[PDB]
Amino acid sequence: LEFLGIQPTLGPPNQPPVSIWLIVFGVVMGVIVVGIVILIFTGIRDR
Amino acid sequence: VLPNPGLDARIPSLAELETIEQEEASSRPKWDNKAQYMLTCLGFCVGLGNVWRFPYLCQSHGGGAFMIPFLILLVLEGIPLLYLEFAIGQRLRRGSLGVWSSIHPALKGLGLASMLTSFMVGLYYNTIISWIMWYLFNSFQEPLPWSDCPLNENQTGYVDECARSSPVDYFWYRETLNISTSISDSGSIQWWMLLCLACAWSVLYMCTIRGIETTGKAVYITSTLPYVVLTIFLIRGLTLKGATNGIVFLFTPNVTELAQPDTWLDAGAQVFFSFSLAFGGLISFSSYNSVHNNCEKDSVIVSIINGFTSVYVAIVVYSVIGFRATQRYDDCFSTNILTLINGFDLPEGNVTQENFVDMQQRCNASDPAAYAQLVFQTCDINAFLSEAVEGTGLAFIVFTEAITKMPLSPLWSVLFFIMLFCLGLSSMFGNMEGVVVPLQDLRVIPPKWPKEVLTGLICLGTFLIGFIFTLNSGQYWLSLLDSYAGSIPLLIIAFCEMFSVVYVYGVDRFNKDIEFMIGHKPNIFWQVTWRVVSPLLMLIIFLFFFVVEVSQELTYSIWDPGYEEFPKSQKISYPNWVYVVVVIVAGVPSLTIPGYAIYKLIRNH
Ligand SMILES: *[C@@H]1O[C@H](CO)[C@@H](O[C@@H]2O[C@H](CO)[C@@H](O)[C@H](O)[C@H]2NC(C)=O)[C@H](O)[C@H]1NC(C)=O
Ligand SMILES: Cc1cc(OCC(=O)NC(C)C)cc(C)c1Cl
Ligand SMILES: *[C@@H]1O[C@H](CO)[C@@H](O)[C@H](O)[C@H]1NC(C)=O
Numbered sequence: 001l002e003f004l005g006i007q008p009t010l011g012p013p014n015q016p017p018v019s020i021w022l023i024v025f026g027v028v029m030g031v032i033v034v035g036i037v038i039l040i041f042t043g044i045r046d047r
Numbered sequence: 048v049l050p051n052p053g054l055d056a057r058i059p060s061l062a063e064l065e066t067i068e069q070e071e072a073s074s075r076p077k078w079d080n081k082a083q084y085m086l087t088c089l090g091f092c093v094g095l096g097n098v099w100r101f102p103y104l105c106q107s108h109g110g111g112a113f114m115i116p117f118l119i120l121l122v123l124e125g126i127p128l129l130y131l132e133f134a135i136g137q138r139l140r141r142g143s144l145g146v147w148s149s150i151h152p153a154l155k156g157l158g159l160a161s162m163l164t165s166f167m168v169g170l171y172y173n174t175i176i177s178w179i180m181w182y183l184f185n186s187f188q189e190p191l192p193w194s195d196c197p198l199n200e201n202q203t204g205y206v207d208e209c210a211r212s213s214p215v216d217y218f219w220y221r222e223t224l225n226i227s228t229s230i231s232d233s234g235s236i237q238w239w240m241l242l243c244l245a246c247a248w249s250v251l252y253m254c255t256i257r258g259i260e261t262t263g264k265a266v267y268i269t270s271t272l273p274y275v276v277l278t279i280f281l282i283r284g285l286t287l288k289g290a291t292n293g294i295v296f297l298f299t300p301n302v303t304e305l306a307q308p309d310t311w312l313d314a315g316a317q318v319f320f321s322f323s324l325a326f327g328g329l330i331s332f333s334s335y336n337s338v339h340n341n342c343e344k345d346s347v348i349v350s351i352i353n354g355f356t357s358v359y360v361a362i363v364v365y366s367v368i369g370f371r372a373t374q375r376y377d378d379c380f381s382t383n384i385l386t387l388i389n390g391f392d393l394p395e396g397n398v399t400q401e402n403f404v405d406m407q408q409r410c411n412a413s414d415p416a417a418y419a420q421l422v423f424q425t426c427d428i429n430a431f432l433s434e435a436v437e438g439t440g441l442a443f444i445v446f447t448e449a450i451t452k453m454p455l456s457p458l459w460s461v462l463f464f465i466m467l468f469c470l471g472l473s474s475m476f477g478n479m480e481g482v483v484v485p486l487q488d489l490r491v492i493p494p495k496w497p498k499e500v501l502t503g504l505i506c507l508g509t510f511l512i513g514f515i516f517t518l519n520s521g522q523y524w525l526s527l528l529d530s531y532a533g534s535i536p537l538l539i540i541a542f543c544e545m546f547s548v549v550y551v552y553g554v555d556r557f558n559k560d561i562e563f564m565i566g567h568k569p570n571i572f573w574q575v576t577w578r579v580v581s582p583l584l585m586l587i588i589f590l591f592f593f594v595v596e597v598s599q600e601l602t603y604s605i606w607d608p609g610y611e612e613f614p615k616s617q618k619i620s621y622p623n624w625v626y627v628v629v630v631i632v633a634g635v636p637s638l639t640i641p642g643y644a645i646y647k648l649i650r651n652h
Contacts, residue, residue, distance in 0.1 A: 009203040013190075021184040029246060035253045043257060043499055 090270025234519020289373020
């Protein structure tokens with residue numbers, strides 16, 4: 001239903017509040033630091 | 048003629064091999080079941096060969112039949128030389144610098160050559176995996192950023208850059224890369240890209256910190272995930288509208304493309320890169336196997352697996368390309384119908400796809416000077432499939448926009464990026480071991496500071512040298528480095544390989560070794576290839592490459608926002624400032640080969 005001279009203008013969406021990729025990277029970094037520390041502890045522990 | 052005196056004084060003798068059997072375990076971690084060893088080898092081979100290389104412009108430039116020569120070239124260079132490799136490390140119980148140090152120490156040039164080649168390859172595959180994991184990070188949400196343009200400050204429209212080009216094109220080139228307008232200008236630090244690269248280096252370090260023992264645990268899933276994902280992506284590919292058109296596009300060749308012999312050169316370079324010979328990795332895996340371990344059959348098993356996975360990847364990618372082309376053609380035809388319907392005020396549903404031409408000419412015949420102002424598009428199939436990406440976009444600016452037109456877009460994007468992550472991890476494992484083994488074998492450090500910190504320092508060195516590709520123009524830099532990955536030095540070390548094996552090392556000794564640990568006397572074709580016929584081809588193709596390259600056509604594409612017909616290609620050739628880099632990056636090993644030989648000749652002879 002177009003009026004040929006009137007265009008829609010009020011349709012601005014904004015779904016993601018703040019950078020969910022930041023939280024994903026944070027959890028990945030946490031998991032990878034846990035792996036680093038457990039691996040280094042096992043390596044220095046295995047005589 | 049074997050002119051080397053004292054050829055036996057350095058190689059482990061048969062009696063010494065018997066004594067050293069089942070008594071040495073320190074510093075030589077024994078593998079688990081040999082099947083796992085083949086699994087790691089084949090995974091590393093497919094990981095290096097496929098991602099960023101096969102579906103790259105190598106596949107999309109020939110556009111079809113490009114791959115038919117490649118497979119043939121396989122049997123002309125893959126099976127023989129891979130048979131020549133995969134066993135020297137088995138016989139010598141040492142690789143990397145050991146093979147070319149223990150035999151004919153005068154040249155000792157392929158060692159550092161392979162070191163430099165592996166370091167160059169890793170330096171940019173780290174950027175590639177960083178981009179892949181960055182695209183993975185932005186997933187896990189329904190409104191994928193590469194699906195709609197961002198509205199500008201006017202709150203009612205999109206930016207001109209996003210409007211003229213595609214949404215995914217803008218997201219890749221602006222939101223992620225923030226690419227510059229040339230090579231001469233330098234941008235900001237792009238902190239998010241550097242952070243992502245740091246995370247990639249950290250996970251690569253975690254996945255391999257102690258050597259093969261840590262690598263094998265991750266391999267069991269790293270080399271199997273992508274294989275399971277490829278089948279499901281294929282079976283999703285067939286059940287798509289307009290599919291199976293890319294498959295018949297791939298199957299049908301053109302003779303004229305076969306006529307041009309540059310495809311031969313590209314296929315040879317690609318098979319050499321994909322099988323990953325002359326890299327030091329395979330000898331390093333093989334140096335920790337039992338003497339009696341079988342090698343002839345597992346090699347051909349790996350070769351067949353790699354050859355079949357290449358076909359599978361090509362089929363999947365061309366199915367997706369065909370689906371995308373069909374969707375674009377349908378959209379263009381719908382627009383063409385709509386413009387005539389609007390212009391002539393016809394009922395909606397009267398001019399369909401089957402009856403468009405007759406109605407189009409009837410409307411024109413009704414009254415000229417009103418049909419004239421109507422502008423129609425001449426889009427046609429078999430021309431949308433031919434449109435290929437100049438580089439790096441076949442998985443970022445093509446596959447993502449095909450994902451967005453499917454039901455479960457976020458999960459499927461996640462699976463695709465996870466499979467790419469796994470393949471990149473396999474390639475990084477292989478390259479990392481291949482570069483770290485020669486450093487330890489060189490004994491440049493004393494017992495103190497063991498491998499746990501040596502790997503740390505070398506990985507930090509790579510991290511702090513790889514900052515260049517994080518710059519705004521860094522992408523352009525990558526374009527000038529990848530084209531020099533399978534460059535002249537790799538080919539020269541390849542040419543060194545087999546003539547050193549066949550003219551310095553005793554071929555009769557190798558044959559006796561085969562009958563010792565393997566038996567099954569090798570076929571006549573094997574020795575004739577190892578001696579002649581096979582060694583010449585690469586020399587001929589190298590001479591052909593040298594003849595071709597005199598017609599220089601070096602040119603890097605530019606985004607160029609300030610440019611009419613902006614969604615197009617930019618040709619700028621190349622500034623001379625980087626020309627000296629070709630001198631720096633190429634031709635260095637040739638300086639070092641004759642030095643020691645001439646020194647020894649003038650000192651003794
Ligand atoms: C339809 O529009 C075209 C636009 O020119 C015209 O076709 C002319 O007649 C024949 C068509 O086969 C062509 O050889 C001419 O070149 C066309 N242009 C002329 C004479 O100027 C015409 O308006 C319409 N043609 C038909 C068949 O309906
Ligand atoms: C394995 C694979 C590689 C591939 O090549 C494109 C590519 O390498 N992109 C990188 C530069 C990120 C494309 C596809 C669909 C698949 Cl499945
Ligand atoms: C021949 O290959 C070229 C690519 O340059 C292309 O024009 C075409 O797809 C092929 N020819 C035919 C008749 O299909």
